[PDB]
C-alpha cells in the first residue's frame, strides 16, 4: 500500500511504479 506522489494515485500493492514515482513516492 503506497501512495503515488506527483502522480495522484494509491497503489494497493507495489505495482508497475511510475517513472516519477519510483523516485518521488520512494521506491
Ligand atoms: Zn505514480
How many Å apart are CA 13 and CA 27, to the nearest integer? 12
CA of 2 to the centre of ligand 1 (A): 10
CA of 23 to the centre of ligand 1 (A): 10
**Range of 23's domain?**
1-27
| Ion ligand 1, residues whose Cβ is below 5 A away | 4, 7, 18, 21
Experimental method: NMR
Q: Which residues contact 4 (CB under 8 A, 6 or more apart)?
A: 10, 11, 18, 21, 25
Are 15 and 21 in contact by the 8 Å Cβ rule? The answer is no
Are 4 and 10 in contact by the 8 Å Cβ rule? The answer is yes
Cell numbers placing 8: 495522484
Count of domains in the chain?
1
Amino acid at each position: 500500500m503506497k501512495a503515488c506522489l506527483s502522480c495522484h494515485q494509491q497503489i494497493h500493492r507495489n505495482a508497475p511504479i511510475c517513472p516519477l514515482c519510483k523516485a518521488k513516492s520512494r521506491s
